[PDB]
Design an enzyme around this catalytic site. Structure first.
Site, PDB file in Angstrom:
ATOM      1  N   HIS A 321       0.838  -1.198   0.000  1.00  0.00           N
ATOM      2  CA  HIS A 321       0.000   0.000   0.000  1.00  0.00           C
ATOM      3  C   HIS A 321       0.875   1.252   0.000  1.00  0.00           C
ATOM      4  CE1 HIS A 321      -3.986   1.971   0.682  1.00  0.00           C
ATOM      5  NE2 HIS A 321      -3.178   2.946   1.060  1.00  0.00           N
ATOM      6  N   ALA A 322       0.743   2.053  -1.058  1.00  0.00           N
ATOM      7  CA  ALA A 322       1.626   3.194  -1.319  1.00  0.00           C
ATOM      8  C   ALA A 322       1.672   4.203  -0.171  1.00  0.00           C
ATOM      9  CB  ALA A 322       1.228   3.881  -2.625  1.00  0.00           C
ATOM     10  N   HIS A 351       0.076  11.846  -6.208  1.00  0.00           N
ATOM     11  CA  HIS A 351      -0.471  11.931  -4.854  1.00  0.00           C
ATOM     12  C   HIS A 351       0.613  11.805  -3.784  1.00  0.00           C
ATOM     13  CE1 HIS A 351      -3.392  11.514  -1.562  1.00  0.00           C
ATOM     14  NE2 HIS A 351      -2.529  10.638  -1.083  1.00  0.00           N
ATOM     15  N   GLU A 352       1.458  10.789  -3.924  1.00  0.00           N
ATOM     16  CA  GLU A 352       2.512  10.511  -2.951  1.00  0.00           C
ATOM     17  C   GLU A 352       3.599  11.582  -2.966  1.00  0.00           C
ATOM     18  OE1 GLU A 352       2.053   8.439  -0.661  1.00  0.00           O
ATOM     19  OE2 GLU A 352       0.389   7.289  -1.514  1.00  0.00           O
ATOM     20  N   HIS A 355       2.689  14.625  -0.844  1.00  0.00           N
ATOM     21  CA  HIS A 355       3.123  14.458   0.541  1.00  0.00           C
ATOM     22  C   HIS A 355       4.602  14.824   0.698  1.00  0.00           C
ATOM     23  CE1 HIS A 355      -0.516  12.736   2.147  1.00  0.00           C
ATOM     24  NE2 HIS A 355      -0.487  11.688   1.346  1.00  0.00           N
ATOM     25  N   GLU A 379      -3.361  15.449   2.246  1.00  0.00           N
ATOM     26  CA  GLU A 379      -3.928  14.568   1.216  1.00  0.00           C
ATOM     27  C   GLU A 379      -4.292  15.303  -0.077  1.00  0.00           C
ATOM     28  OE1 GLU A 379      -3.501  11.553   1.581  1.00  0.00           O
ATOM     29  OE2 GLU A 379      -3.022  11.632   3.716  1.00  0.00           O
ATOM     30  N   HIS A 481      -6.723   1.044   5.620  1.00  0.00           N
ATOM     31  CA  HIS A 481      -6.751   2.061   6.668  1.00  0.00           C
ATOM     32  C   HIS A 481      -7.423   1.600   7.950  1.00  0.00           C
ATOM     33  CE1 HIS A 481      -6.107   4.097   2.871  1.00  0.00           C
ATOM     34  NE2 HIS A 481      -5.591   5.114   3.538  1.00  0.00           N
ATOM     35  N   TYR A 491      -9.421  12.198   3.874  1.00  0.00           N
ATOM     36  CA  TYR A 491      -9.661  12.038   2.439  1.00  0.00           C
ATOM     37  C   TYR A 491     -10.951  12.722   1.992  1.00  0.00           C
ATOM     38  CZ  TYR A 491      -5.896   8.602   2.952  1.00  0.00           C
ATOM     39  OH  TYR A 491      -4.719   7.966   3.263  1.00  0.00           O
TER      40      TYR A 491
HETATM   41  N1  LIG Z   1      -4.020   2.679  -5.553  1.00  0.00           N
HETATM   42  C1  LIG Z   1      -4.141   3.985  -4.876  1.00  0.00           C
HETATM   43  C2  LIG Z   1      -3.245   4.006  -3.637  1.00  0.00           C
HETATM   44  C3  LIG Z   1      -3.315   5.359  -2.918  1.00  0.00           C
HETATM   45  C4  LIG Z   1      -2.391   5.368  -1.701  1.00  0.00           C
HETATM   46  C5  LIG Z   1      -2.868   6.188  -0.488  1.00  0.00           C
HETATM   47  N2  LIG Z   1      -2.016   5.710   0.613  1.00  0.00           N
HETATM   48  C6  LIG Z   1      -2.013   6.563   1.809  1.00  0.00           C
HETATM   49  C7  LIG Z   1      -1.059   5.972   2.852  1.00  0.00           C
HETATM   50  C8  LIG Z   1      -1.588   6.235   4.261  1.00  0.00           C
HETATM   51  C9  LIG Z   1      -0.649   5.760   5.376  1.00  0.00           C
HETATM   52  C10 LIG Z   1      -0.812   6.284   6.661  1.00  0.00           C
HETATM   53  C11 LIG Z   1       0.023   5.871   7.699  1.00  0.00           C
HETATM   54  C12 LIG Z   1       1.028   4.932   7.456  1.00  0.00           C
HETATM   55  C13 LIG Z   1       1.197   4.410   6.173  1.00  0.00           C
HETATM   56  C14 LIG Z   1       0.356   4.819   5.136  1.00  0.00           C
HETATM   57  C15 LIG Z   1      -1.582   7.975   1.441  1.00  0.00           C
HETATM   58  O1  LIG Z   1      -0.495   8.107   0.838  1.00  0.00           O
HETATM   59  O2  LIG Z   1      -2.362   8.896   1.762  1.00  0.00           O
HETATM   60  C16 LIG Z   1      -4.358   5.903  -0.205  1.00  0.00           C
HETATM   61  O3  LIG Z   1      -4.693   5.238   0.775  1.00  0.00           O
HETATM   62  N3  LIG Z   1      -5.185   6.451  -1.103  1.00  0.00           N
HETATM   63  C17 LIG Z   1      -6.650   6.239  -1.304  1.00  0.00           C
HETATM   64  C18 LIG Z   1      -7.498   7.506  -1.120  1.00  0.00           C
HETATM   65  C19 LIG Z   1      -6.976   8.542  -2.136  1.00  0.00           C
HETATM   66  C20 LIG Z   1      -6.930   9.857  -1.935  1.00  0.00           C
HETATM   67  N4  LIG Z   1      -6.406  10.465  -3.002  1.00  0.00           N
HETATM   68  C21 LIG Z   1      -6.091   9.555  -3.920  1.00  0.00           C
HETATM   69  C22 LIG Z   1      -5.523   9.663  -5.193  1.00  0.00           C
HETATM   70  C23 LIG Z   1      -5.295   8.519  -5.957  1.00  0.00           C
HETATM   71  C24 LIG Z   1      -5.640   7.269  -5.446  1.00  0.00           C
HETATM   72  C25 LIG Z   1      -6.210   7.167  -4.177  1.00  0.00           C
HETATM   73  C26 LIG Z   1      -6.436   8.311  -3.407  1.00  0.00           C
HETATM   74  C27 LIG Z   1      -7.175   4.929  -0.692  1.00  0.00           C
HETATM   75  O4  LIG Z   1      -8.150   4.949   0.081  1.00  0.00           O
HETATM   76  O5  LIG Z   1      -6.570   3.913  -1.082  1.00  0.00           O
HETATM   77 ZN   LIG Z   2      -2.035  10.489   0.944  1.00  0.00          ZN
END
Ligand SMILES: NCCCC[C@H](N[C@@H](CCc1ccccc1)C(=O)O)C(=O)N[C@H](Cc1c[nH]c2ccccc12)C(=O)O
Ligand SMILES: [Zn+2]
Ligand SMILES: *[C@@H]1O[C@H](CO)[C@@H](O[C@@H]2O[C@H](CO)[C@@H](O[C@@H]3O[C@H](CO[C@H]4O[C@H](CO)[C@@H](O)[C@H](O)[C@@H]4O)[C@@H](O)[C@H](O[C@H]4O[C@H](CO[C@@H]5O[C@H](CO)[C@@H](O)[C@H](O)[C@@H]5O)[C@@H](O)[C@H](O)[C@@H]4O)[C@@H]3O)[C@H](O)[C@H]2NC(C)=O)[C@H](O)[C@H]1NC(C)=O
Ligand SMILES: *[C@@H]1O[C@H](CO)[C@@H](O)[C@H](O)[C@H]1NC(C)=O
Ligand SMILES: *[C@@H]1O[C@H](CO)[C@@H](O)[C@H](O)[C@H]1NC(C)=O
Length: 598
Positions: A321-322, A351-352, A355, A379, A481, A491
């Protein structure tokens, strides 16, 4: 005197912030090592260091009572001291904290280790969510295959972890009350520094809800034409396994079968990415390029040296999970992503990196201020850029979208495609925390926990499981999550405020004028815009030094979270869709689901 004490307090804070950053660095390294490499040894290390940091936080919170900080003149000093008083889980007795840590790693590692057997090969049982199961859920149009993978995954990621989740709720509640919050709901909500925050979101959601109902109705109508009425009913909740996502949180993967105008272009650049030889490295380099083009900060060498941007090919377990990581020194920032070459993944990279940019922008701040203005702000950053990269305008520039004619029908297709991610997500996001809040607040008896989850998913999203579930199942932790104890309201906040940011960035870039047909909001590209970047720099550099309305004000002069911007973006779709649903006599709304037996 208080004059001399406030001078000593300032010196105390400067030293303590530096000490906290250094201690958190150690914790973060252990957490990184575990997430990159799940072993019993790394789990033990991660948790023991966290226990050590918690013990130090207790001593800090205790030491703040030695300062008359509430009596100080400086709002800045008082804000820092207040941040230090908030212990969260670190308020728990030594033994209780250790138990919670063990409970949290048990749930996260369970999720990360889920493997299912191939639908067509009962001997091949090494299929993981990322990428194997998610590939099927997004690509297969075999409803029985989809239902198989749904059931297998939810049973292993959700139900297996019920007892751990119950103990987590207990200890989360105990921690909250030791901080004198009513429950973990109020502990989470405290991050938004606004006692009317829940009502505000209810008010915004209620304004957007009618548009969601129209999208839901139209999607259901289109799914009936594809799967038949034996699979999808006109009047019932949509079977969720047909929506192209394991949690039905975004429906963009089924756009090819539900698009308003199937004879007109629908943007899907994954094929062209592969044809042009795109790699994970190139995707991150392009994201880096977008940020630097706006006169924002280039990724440091540590990022390239230390990030994991491809799934490891060895036998190891890891969290795919990214995620984006701040190590609280200078320029030590990292991403861990199991990157695939797809359109969806290109957005995820952005997205990443959003951050990462925030981390770099506020790294000069005192430690306690090295976080987002509120969790929703963090976010939103990357999503603002993703909104631009998703436009036909941008995708044509980078040669990923070819022979595209942007007529009225293509525009509706693109608007609809965007809404399948942006509007559909809103009730989903709201329910993740509405559910957990209700458990935290003790509003649901343990005997009713599972159907309480599905009741919310029904009421808000109008979706339901493919098969009958009961209190014998426990489906909530099947979402990352929920197993990983990550607050989700961030989100929902993000998906609203990202449009406020986007609209303002586009206006600043000269890319949006409401009175100019040549510059619609839905085709704005902020690439190369120093002006848009300047607004971001102004806001992001603040970190959490000021309450979030001050950070919003630094961006665009506004102080209020508002649904005006998101509604403005989708207004052309709303007009078209309302008329299309009337034209096709589309049934709107849904009967209560029969898929959770009480
Ligand atoms: N395939 C899509 C993966 C998106 C990765 C992200 N991951 C989170 C990681 C949160 C975290 C908190 C604490 C410890 C480790 C990790 C993030 O970076 O926000 C996330 O949860 N993302 C989504 C919600 C989301 C908001 N914007 C996005 C833009 C594009 C895609 C998804 C999203 C999810 O509910 O999956
Ligand atoms: Zn995020
Ligand atoms: C969550 O809420 C909790 C309350 O529900 C709260 O717990 C309370 O914290 C108080 C500390 O702020 C604490 O108050 C102390 O009480 C001591 C005596 O307590 C006994 O009797 C109680 C019955 O009510 C029992 O429950 C206890 O077990 C004890 O047996 C006092 O000795 C103590 O006093 C000292 O400290 C004050 C400091 O106050 C300031 O001092 C400065 C000087 O620098 C002054 O300038 C300023 O004006 C101000 O007075 C001194 O004044 C005094 O001289 C003593 O040195 C103190 O009153 C309380 O016991 C505790 N529990 C309860 C049930 O009340 C948690 O702290 C909250 N948690 C969080 C995280 O916020
Ligand atoms: C994973 O961790 C183990 C010990 O937990 C360690 O021995 C090994 O080197 C790590 N594997 C990789 C590929 O880094
Ligand atoms: C780039 O940002 C710096 C400060 O971060 C600013 O001084 C400079 O004017 C910006 N460049 C442009 C072209 O605006």
């Amino acid at each position: 005197a208080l004059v001399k004490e406030e001078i000593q307090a300032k010196e105390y804070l400067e030293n303590l912030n530096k000490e906290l950053a250094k201690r958190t660095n150690v914790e973060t390294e252990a957490a990184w090592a575990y997430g990159s490499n799940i072993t019993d040894e790394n789990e033990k290390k991660k948790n023991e260091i966290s226990a050590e940091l918690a013990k130090f936080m207790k001593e800090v919170a205790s030491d703040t009572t030695k300062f008359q900080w509430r009596s100080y003149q400086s709002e800045d000093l008082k804000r820092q001291f207040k941040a230090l008083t908030k212990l969260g889980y670190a308020a728990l007795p030594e033994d209780d904290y250790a138990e919670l840590l063990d409970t949290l790693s048990a749930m996260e590692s369970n999720f990360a280790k889920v493997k299912v057997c191939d639908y067509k090969d009962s001997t091949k049982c090494d299929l993981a969510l990322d990428p194997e199961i998610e590939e099927v859920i997004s690509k297969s149009r075999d409803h029985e295959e989809l239902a198989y993978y749904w059931r297998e995954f939810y049973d292993k990621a959700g139900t297996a972890v019920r007892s751990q989740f119950e103990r987590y709720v207990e200890l989360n509640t105990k921690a909250a009350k030791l901080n004198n919050f009513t429950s973990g709901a109020e502990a989470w909500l405290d991050e938004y520094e606004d006692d009317t925050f829940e009502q505000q979101l209810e008010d915004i959601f209620a304004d957007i809800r009618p548009l969601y109902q129209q999208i839901h109705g139209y999607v259901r109508f289109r799914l009936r034409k594809h799967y038949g009425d034996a699979v999808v009913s006109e009047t019932g909740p949509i079977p969720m396994h047909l929506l192209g996502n394991m949690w039905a949180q975004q429906w963009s993967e089924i756009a090819d079968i539900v698009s308003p105008f199937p004879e007109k272009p629908l943007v899907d650049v994954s094929a062209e990415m592969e044809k042009q030889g795109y790699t994970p490295l190139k995707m991150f380099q392009m994201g880096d390029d977008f940020f630097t083009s706006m006169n924002l900060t280039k990724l440091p060498q540590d990022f390239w040296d230390k990030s994991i941007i491809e799934k490891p090919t060895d036998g190891r377990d890891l969290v795919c999970h990214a995620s984006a990581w701040d190590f609280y020194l200078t320029d030590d920032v990292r991403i861990k992503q199991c990157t695939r070459v797809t359109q969806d993944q290109l957005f995820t990279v952005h997205h990443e990196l959003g951050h990462i940019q925030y981390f770099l922008q506020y790294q000069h701040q005192p430690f306690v201020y090295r976080t987002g203005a509120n969790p929703g702000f963090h976010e939103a950053v990357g999503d603002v850029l993703s909104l631009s990269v998703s436009t036909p305008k941008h995708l044509e520039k980078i040669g990923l979208l070819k022979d595209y004619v942007r007529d009225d029908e293509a525009r509706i297709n693109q608007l609809f495609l965007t809404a399948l991610d942006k509007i559909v997500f809103l009730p989903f996001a709201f329910t993740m925390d509405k559910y957990r809040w209700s458990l935290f607040r003790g509003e649901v008896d343990k005997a009713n926990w599972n159907c309480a989850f599905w009741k919310l998913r029904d009421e808000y999203s109008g979706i339901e499981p493919p098969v009958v579930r009961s209190e014998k199942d426990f489906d909530a932790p099947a979402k990352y999550h929920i197993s990983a104890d990550v607050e989700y309201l961030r989100y929902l906040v993000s998906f609203i405020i990202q449009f406020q940011f986007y609209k303002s960035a586009c206006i600043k870039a000269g890319q949006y004028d409401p009175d100019n047909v040549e510059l619609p909001l839905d085709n704005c590209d902020i690439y190369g815009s120093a002006a848009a970047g300047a607004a971001f720099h102004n806001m992001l550099s603040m970190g959490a030094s000021k309450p979030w309305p001050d950070a919003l004000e630094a961006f665009n002069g506004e102080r209020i979270m508002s649904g005006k911007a998101i509604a403005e973006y989708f207004e052309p779709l709303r007009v078209w869709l309302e008329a299309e649903n009337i034209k096709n006599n589309v049934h709107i709304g849904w009967t209560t689901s029969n898929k959770c037996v009480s």
